[PDB]
């Protein structure tokens, strides 16, 4: 009778997006706002005025 789309299926072209759909990334609020120091020891001790 006729060439259906199922009969032609193996001949059909294909297409792909060039890129992945994903949310925007961002960093920690912590490292953005607060000051930081290099530690050389794995614990740092800090004197504080108390009275």
């Amino acid at each position: 009778a006729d060439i259906s789309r199922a009969d032609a299926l193996a001949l059909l072209a294909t297409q792909e997006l060039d890129s992945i759909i994903k949310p925007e990334t961002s960093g920690s609020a912590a490292l953005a706002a607060f000051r930081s120091i290099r530690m050389s020891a794995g614990t740092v001790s800090m004197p504080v005025l108390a009275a």
Partner: protein
């Protein structure tokens, strides 16, 4: 696509999320970090007000900045989630005229309250069931970087019972060493004085 080129940006985001929810909300805070996280620390200090206590959210923020000021600290930073933008645009007087915006037609600038820049926490680390807003003195928090992010390609290790070489697999191992403390003195103040305040939800 390059698999590691997609995996690496997502891991450095996840490290930032794990650190934030430890520092701000205390969720998996290490037992060796003896200071409370900033939000539960402000609640425990009594520097807290429920949203909808005052006239409007700008009244509640004025009281929140007031707790920091009365503890002899300076408001230098404020943190919130994206949901606060509609709350600030929604600030009307009792005649329903806007008090935050320059009218409802052409304005949406939501960066700032009482001249203080707002840090919108888009890392999905913010918990809006715990805090509407956190404000305080940024100088009174100290982070330590002990070791920057290290990443190693593993090709022969056994991971979770997966033998990588025998299974033709590979892995990236990422590690980062960091410390958190609150660095403030309460000499002459009360022992409960604290450099941050929170608005809790209504």
């Amino acid at each position: 696509f390059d698999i590691w080129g997609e995996v690496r940006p997502l891991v450095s985001q996840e490290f930032g999320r794990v650190l934030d929810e430890a520092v701000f909300f205390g969720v998996n805070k290490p037992a060796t970090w003896l200071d409370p996280a900033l939000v539960p620390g402000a609640i425990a200090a009594g520097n807290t007000i429920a949203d909808g206590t005052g006239i409007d959210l700008a009244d509640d923020i004025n009281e929140a900045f007031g707790f920091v000021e009365d503890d002899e600290f300076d408001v230098n930073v404020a943190f919130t989630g994206r949901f606060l933008r509609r709350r600030l645009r929604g600030l009307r007087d009792a005649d329903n005229a806007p008090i935050y915006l320059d009218g409802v037609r052409s304005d949406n600038r939501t960066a700032e309250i009482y001249g203080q820049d707002l840090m919108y926490v888009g890392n999905r680390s913010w918990d809006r069931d715990e805090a509407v807003l956190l404000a305080g003195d940024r100088s009174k928090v100290l982070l330590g970087i002990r070791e920057d992010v290290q990443v190693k390609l593993l090709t022969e290790a056994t991971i979770g019972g997966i033998n990588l070489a025998e299974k033709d697999m590979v892995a990236l191992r990422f590690k980062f060493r960091v410390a958190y403390s609150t660095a403030f003195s309460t000499a002459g103040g009360e022992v409960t004085d604290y450099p941050f305040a929170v608005i809790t939800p209504d």
